[PDB]
Structures are given as C-alpha cells and as structure tokens.
Symmetry: D2
Subunit: 133 residues, 4 copies
C-alpha cells in the first residue's frame, strides 16, 4: 500500500509486456487520467498503420491500465509553468510536476523527461528496484 511511482504512457506501454514482474507490486504504482488516453492514442496509431490484433491488444492494454492507481489532476496553472520553464510539452510537464511535487519517482521511457525530472528512472530501472523486494 502507498504509492511510490508515477508511470507515464511510454512506461506503461513498455510495462504491459512484463505484467507478471510487477502486478504483485501494483500498490506502489500510479498513473494520471491522461495516461489512459495517451496509451489509447498510441495503440490507435498502430491500428492505423496495420496492426491486425488491435482489438485483442486493446483489451490487454485495458487490463494493464486497470492495475494502476489513478492520481488527481494537477492544476493546469502549475503544469503550464513547468512546461514553459523546462521546455517540455504540457503533456510531459504534467508528469514531471505531479512526480516532483508529490515526492514520487517518475517512471518514463522518454529521454527528455528522465533528464528534466528529478528522480526519474526508466522501466528497466523500475524492474530491478521491484525485484529487490
């Protein structure tokens, strides 16, 4: 119990393939309402370019996302400031803001975020940390 990591869309995407390795740790994981849509839009672009099992895959992504705790939305107010100050998009900035102000570890697969978010790690790093418990 008690959230420790905030997972963004590219991290969630990577994680969907290691279900077993982390579900037992699902209590330490969270996302934003935003992630659901971003994961969806990414699955959508794949179906647009030919992914055949998009439907089945769509069900599995749904199951993966259901495993996570969902945090409250950050104030648009603050996020914009962080986006303007760090050269991030409003989307990425939302994760950086919530992670730092909430004292959480931001798991992302983006190189820009890892570098502009204090304490940010990648999916792999998250895995070693979880396996060590």
């Amino acid at each position: 119990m008690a959230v420790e990591y905030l997972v963004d869309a590219s991290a969630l995407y990577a994680l969907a393939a290691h279900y077993d390795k982390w579900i037992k740790h699902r209590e330490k994981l969270a996302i934003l309402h935003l992630t659901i849509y971003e994961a969806g839009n990414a699955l959508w672009k794949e179906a647009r370019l030919g992914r055949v099992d998009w439907a089945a895959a769509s069900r599995h992504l749904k199951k993966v996302l259901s495993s996570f705790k969902v945090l409250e939305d950050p104030p648009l107010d603050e996020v914009l400031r962080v986006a303007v100050e760090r050269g991030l998009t409003f989307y990425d900035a939302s994760y950086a803001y919530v992670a730092e102000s909430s004292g959480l570890v931001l798991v992302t697969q983006d190189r820009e975020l890892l570098a502009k978010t204090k304490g940010a790690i990648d999916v792999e790093t998250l895995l070693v940390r979880l396996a060590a418990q």
Copy 2:
C-alpha cells in the same frame, strides 16, 4: 455521479466558451468535460505561450477557473473508444468524446467540423449558446 448533465464539452468548445462565461455560467450544472479535456485545453494554451503569448500565466489562471466550473465524467473503456476511433476514422482523443456523448445520451459540444459530422446530435458552441439563452 451527477445527472443534471445534458452536454459533453470538448477542448475546442471549452476554449471558445472561455470567452463567454456569462452566457453559460448559470447553466454549468448542465455541462461536463472528460479528464482528457483538462490536458487538451492546457496543451493548447501551451502552444500559444510557445509562440509568444505574453499573458500565458494570467490566461492559465483564467482557463483554470473556467475548467473548475464543469462536472467531470469518468474515463471511458479504452477498447470501446478504440473501436469508435477505427470505425469512424477519428483520433483516439476525438473518439473518446463521440463515445461518451453517444453512450450517455449527451449532446457533444465541439468546434471540430469532423466531430460534428461523425457524432450524432453534436452541436457547436453557437448552437449551444442559443439553446441556453432559451431556458
């Protein structure tokens, strides 16, 4: 959640409405947005700031208040939306709106012509304003 909601407002509409507070404020219980709406409105203001909007900060505070006035619905099932996306040739983001409006029997208010076309019962901000003026 609530139930006095008749309209689902999207980012493009919300943005237009932001400059017509008075005409709809007293009807607020009738309008709703999705969580996604918060980020989309933000991303739009963000782009203006990136392009040199002087008052982005002040404007962000205003946009914030405007958003606080709306009821926020629950997130839709991912798979359903993806299907609507694929079927009507919409982005997953825009399909989230079409699905929720039609699934809940709500009127989608959008400024996007494509959405108006593929979402049954959808109206634009102007149409929304007239309907409110008469009630």
Copy 3:
C-alpha cells in the same frame, strides 16, 4: 515519366527493411519533400524513447531516402481542398493529391489513406507487384 509509385512516410519506413527487394526498381519510386522530414521525425521519436542505435540507423535512412526521386511540391490550395473533403490531415492529403494528380499509385501503410486514395496500396502489395518484373 518512368516513376510509377509515390511512397509516403509509413511506406518508406517499412521499405527500409527490404532494401534489396525494391532497390532495382527505384527509378519507378518517388517521394515528396515532406517525406524526408516525416521519416526523420519517426526516427527521432524512437531515439527520444531510448533507441540506442539511432546514430547508425539515421545513416541507413539517409541512404534509403537517397534512392528515391523527389517530386515537386503540390499547390497548397489543392491539397487543402482534398484534406477538407476527405477528412485527412494536410500531410496525408498531400500524398493523396499528388499520387492521384500525377497518375501514380500511392504506397501507404495507413489504412485511412488506402481507403481514401484511389489506387493506393500497401508495402506488401507493392513488393508482390515488383516481384512480377
């Protein structure tokens, strides 16, 4: 003209892994100027997401793009008309207009563009055709 096919970003991106299969038919393969940027952006997103071999891969992509002939830019007002009438992005509409306008076969991996561009085909269909020659 000897050119028969207009290849877009999604087509071009896949084609890059079947170099030998089309390189001999190259003089029948063309792209738009936009194609360069779109392809570079796709690789960029991959690097932003942790693609280690992005330095070397960008070189392979350059070579790939160099094998294609580059068509002249379409009229903005025409491309917009198509984008608005068929519900396509301006970028996508470009390919639709040029291909149909020039009597070429649009090769796209985008279901949306296939369904909306008269004669459009996918990469697989392109290969089988070149195979018959």
Copy 4:
C-alpha cells in the same frame, strides 16, 4: 542573396505583413517543410470552423511562393541537432539549416529562439528590414 530562414510560425505571421517584406523577399527563404507546416495550420483552422479557408489558402499560396526554397538537410545531421538540443526533428531542421548556412533563423517559437545561435522573431526581423 538569402540572409533569413523563415519557419512556419514566422511565415504564418508574416503573411499578415505582406507589404513590410516583399521588396525584401530575395533575402527570405524557407524549407520545403514550411509549405506542409503552413498548410497544416490552415487545415486546423478550417477544421475548427474557419469559413474563408479556401480564400485564405490562396493568399497563403502567394505568400509562400515569394520565398526561395533551400535544399533539404541531411536527415543525418538534423537528427543529431534535435537529440542534443531537445528539439523535435522539424524544429531542429530549421536550427541546422540556418546555422550550417550562416543564416538568421526567424521563428515565432520561444524554444527555437533560445536554441539557435542568432535566431530572432518576426518583430525583430521587421525592425531590421525597416532600417535597410
């Protein structure tokens, strides 16, 4: 000759200040990309209700045609500029050409103004032409 490389956000604003720069056109160039980005912005406005999109598309055609068009950069290079300076491949494309070509990047994008040596905005470009 060419002195300034104008991107999409800049090209778009300048389209309202035609008389202020035509006579200076030969000093103005874009990328092939600039055509697609401009058209995509008008498309968004048309999608969002703009009524005079057809007419507006013609004026944009004329404006865009008044600019020389540089050769496409080595996808090779550009990518590097973008990874290092945290830009997108599109923006980086402009930072590369202007620099590697000793041109002054003209952009309405704060992020680019700051990551491209000697880059200036629309207003800045307009005061200069006023002088010359």
